[PDB]
């Protein structure tokens, strides 16, 4: 006794699914409307569809929804795995598939979930094995033919739905394709995963829904389980009264976020580590935070926001730090790729890499992309007359197509960062791609840089950061980081707070890696960009 | 294009057979400057593959086929670097040039872009259209986007305070302009157009 009741109540249901509202309701109605009343389909005089191809990233919850529908309806969930049914014996995997379909058609109208169909559907042309084509033909025979199916629906699951046969993706077999790929759904999953345990009273789920921006849904349960394990692990070192006042806290969730990092997603500061550049911080904060926080006002105005920002100037200025600081406050991801870390010697590999990065960008909205070394990627294609020139032309055309081509530009924030804007072609600087031409160029700013660098550091009341910043006279953020690193090395040498003599002995060994003629060139380029903006005034209508 | 040997041509054959099967069909080839590059001679493996792909395109658009309805639209920005075997009637017969918009065209572009945007009643766009030159549709889009951003700024700082984007918003947005296409790049297009003429 009791066991048969518990194993009935532990079953999953529609109350245990979160975020996939519209597709869950669509599958629910298209399954249950045949099962609740067939008189409606008798009156309308048509047969319902009998095939669902589910696609998306692995770990989303597709088989959980299929099991929930199979639990909420009087069906029989039979699970068929992809690599399990395939064997090396000739005529054995087809026999296993026929036996599974006969078992599904024998007892009751049931629901078949064949998982990982991409392993047993090699498109009949790219494969070399005969057994794969044989089981593909067995699947098309069991799904369509003379008296093929008698009141039974099959469900599939895959990650890449393009490597399936066009005969498999036909009507009657997989006639409905469901894309199970946000913050409110993640909060619903957190609420349904933290339902059977009293965690605390002062735990706020807003930070847990905003910081885990790249979690697919199957990692949230592992996160909560790891937190519940770590709480009992850290609360058992010393130990009726122990069971009272149990549960996880915010530091437990912070430790779960820190010890465990993988988000099962292929994705590569807080407004304080950057010093100076107040108007640049304000402009980036505006042009990033408004299309994320107020979509309804932008749909009321009926206009699409701007996307691309391009920075240029001397190296060691803080462009990557600015990109991280504008990415860190939103709930977006961050894909920071480098210039020469995508080019290959093969034919088509660089453009394939560009397509994969942009597909991974548009597969998770919103997402800011950080393209570095635009002078190394674009090269202002023009004419080179060579193999490297043709590869550069093809890379530039693929990049131009991915920025503004046959796309939807849902939520992609491309941010470029180069140190030579003269070697960029005038097609990426067109508005709509990289329209924001923000130039990133003092002692009052170096004070803020030293205050942002010395955030969590034991400081001396006798040191003067104004006296440190006054003797710079044209240093960079990299030079200030080198000075701070030398002071920290001298501090750890004196240990094995920061004192003033460490800075006094480290200020002499400065670098000043930037010369003067490159500064003259950058000022001449900025003056040319200022003089190109001509005959423009307040412009009274 | 593909990494391997003889696969970009299988790709071209597959897409064109798909087009011929599901006729009528419109195949939009974007940036022909990549695929349909002047064959000539490059003396390299990339040269060999980029010539094989062009030759496949020639035999697929005008070869031994049934002439079923398939309309190929090409869109390029360097038409001087395309094989003349493509630029010929039978494959791509008519070369339509789209210069920068004139005053009426740009005014119509602004009106089309603001089709679904609340605007002031007395704000005519003729002044902003006459007080510009050398611009493109993308540039007009940028000006409109900046005006919308200033209007949203005003709305947020007020917070239906400002239902309509106003003349001062548009003027402040137009205070800075893009000027995407420079004369250095435009004179080459003018030379190409007059050479074609």
């Amino acid at each position: 006794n009791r066991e048969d009741e518990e194993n009935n109540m532990n079953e999953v249901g529609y109350d245990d699914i979160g975020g996939c509202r519209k597709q869950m309701a669509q599958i629910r109605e298209m399954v249950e409307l045949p099962l609740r009343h067939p008189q409606l389909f008798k009156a309308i005089g048509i047969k319902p569809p009998r095939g669902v191809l589910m696609y998306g990233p692995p770990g989303t919850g597709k088989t959980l929804m299929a099991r929930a529908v199979a639990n909420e309806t009087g069906a029989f969930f039979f699970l068929i795995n992809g690599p399990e049914v395939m064997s090396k014996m000739a005529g054995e995997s087809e026999s296993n598939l026929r036996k599974a379909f006969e078992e599904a058609e024998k007892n009751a109208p049931a629901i078949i979930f064949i998982d990982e169909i991409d392993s047993i559907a090699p498109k009949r042309d790219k494969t070399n094995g005969e057994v794969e084509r044989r089981v593909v033909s067995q699947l098309l025979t069991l799904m369509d033919g003379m008296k093929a199916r008698s009141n039974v629906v099959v469900i599939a699951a895959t990650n890449r739905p393009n490597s399936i046969d066009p005969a498999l993706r036909r009507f009657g077999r997989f006639d409905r394709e469901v894309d199970i790929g946000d913050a409110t759904g993640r909060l619903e999953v957190l609420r349904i995963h933290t339902k059977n345990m009293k965690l605390a009273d002062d735990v706020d789920l807003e930070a847990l829904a905003a910081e885990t921006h790249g979690y697919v849904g199957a990692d949230i349960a592992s996160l909560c389980s790891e937190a519940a394990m770590q709480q009992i692990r850290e609360k058992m070192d010393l130990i009726a009264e122990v069971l009272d006042s149990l549960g996880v806290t915010m530091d437990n969730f912070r430790f779960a976020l820190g010890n465990s990092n993988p988000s099962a997603l292929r994705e590569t500061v807080t407004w304080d580590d950057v010093g100076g550049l107040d108007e640049i911080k304000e402009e980036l904060k505006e042009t990033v935070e408004y299309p994320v926080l107020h979509p309804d006002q932008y749909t009321k105005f009926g206009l699409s926001p701007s996307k691309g920002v391009l920075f240029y100037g001397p190296p060691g200025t803080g462009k990557t730090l600015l990109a991280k600081a504008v990415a860190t406050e939103v709930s977006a991801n961050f894909i920071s790729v480098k210039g020469p870390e995508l080019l290959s010697m093969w034919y088509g590999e660089s453009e394939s890499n560009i397509r994969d990065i942009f597909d991974k960008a548009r597969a998770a909205a919103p997402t800011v992309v950080f393209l570095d070394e635009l002078d190394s990627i674009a090269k202002a294609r023009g004419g080179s007359l060579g193999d490297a020139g043709g590869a550069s032309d093809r890379v530039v055309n693929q990049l131009l197509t991915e920025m503004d081509g046959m796309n939807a530009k849902k939520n992609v924030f491309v941010i470029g960062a180069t140190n030579r804007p003269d070697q960029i072609d005038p097609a990426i600087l067109r508005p709509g791609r990289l329209d924001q031409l923000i130039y990133v160029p003092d002692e009052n700013a170096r004070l803020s840089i030293l205050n942002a660098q010395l955030r969590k550091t034991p400081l001396e009341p006798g040191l003067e950061l104004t006296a440190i910043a006054k003797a710079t006279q044209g240093f960079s953020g990299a030079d200030l980081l080198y000075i701070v690193q030398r002071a920290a090395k001298y501090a750890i040498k004196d240990s094995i707070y920061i004192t003033k003599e460490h800075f006094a002995e480290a200020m002499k060994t400065a670098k000043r890696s930037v010369s003067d003629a490159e500064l003259r060139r950058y000022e001449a380029y900025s003056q040319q960009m200022k003089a190109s903006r001509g005959q423009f005034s307040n412009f009274n209508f | 294009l593909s990494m391997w040997y003889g696969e970009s041509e299988s790709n071209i054959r597959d897409i064109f057979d798909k087009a011929r099967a599901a006729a009528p069909t419109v195949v939009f080839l974007d940036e022909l400057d990549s695929i349909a590059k002047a064959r000539g001679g490059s003396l390299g493996d990339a040269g060999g593959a980029s010539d094989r792909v062009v030759n496949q395109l020639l035999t697929e658009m005008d070869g031994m086929n049934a002439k079923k309805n398939v309309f190929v639209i090409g869109a390029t920005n360097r038409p001087d670097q395309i094989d003349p075997a493509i630029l010929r009637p039978g494959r791509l017969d008519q070369l339509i040039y789209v210069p920068l918009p004139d005053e009426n065209a740009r005014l119509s572009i602004l009106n089309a872009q603001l089709r679904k945007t609340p605007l002031e009643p007395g704000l005519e766009l003729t002044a902003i259209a006459k007080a510009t030159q050398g611009f493109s549709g993308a540039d007009l889009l940028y000006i409109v986007q900046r005006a919308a951003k200033y209007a949203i700024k005003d709305s947020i700082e007020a917070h239906d305070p400002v239902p309509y984007i106003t003349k001062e918003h548009f003027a402040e947005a137009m205070k800075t302009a893009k000027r995407s296409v420079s004369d250095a790049e435009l004179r080459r297009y003018e030379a190409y157009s007059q050479q074609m003429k």
Binding site: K88, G129, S344, G390 | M3, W4, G44, D45, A46
Partner: peptide, 23 residues
């Protein structure tokens, strides 16, 4: 009385492909 039986199932081979470089 008992009896024996013969069985010959399948085999698996390995192919070789050609690649194209861009210098």
């Amino acid at each position: 009385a008992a009896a024996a039986a013969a069985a010959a199932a399948a085999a698996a081979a390995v192919a070789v492909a050609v690649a194209v470089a861009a210098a």
